[PDB]
Chain A
Amino acid sequence: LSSPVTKSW
C-alpha cells in the first residue's frame, strides 16, 4: 500500500 503523503518540493 502506497504512501498518501504529499511531498511538494
Chain B
Amino acid sequence: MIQRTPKIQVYSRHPAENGKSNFLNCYVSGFHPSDIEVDLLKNGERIEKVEHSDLSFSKDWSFYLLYYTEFTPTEKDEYACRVNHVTLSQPKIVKWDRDM
C-alpha cells in the first residue's frame, strides 16, 4: 500500500562520560508498516543483549519503537544503530555523535 520510511535517532539516556555506565538508545519512528529490523552496533559489530519497547503508534498511525542497551562509553569505541525496513533498499546506519 502506502508505506512510510523510519526516522532514526541514536543517543544516550544521560550525557556521556567515558568510564561511566549509561544506556545507548536507538529510537525509530514515523514508519509503516510495523515490521522493522534494528541493531545496535559497537565498532561495527552487533550488540547481543538489546531490549526494545512494546509496539505503539502516533496519532498519524505511524509506529515507533525504542531499542536500548546498557553500555559504558570510552574515547575509542564507536556506536551506531542499523535499521532495515521494507522502504529501504539497504540497511541505513546512523552513527552516535555525543553532541548530536
Query: Is there direct touching of A and B in the complex, by C-beta distance under 8 Å?
Result: no
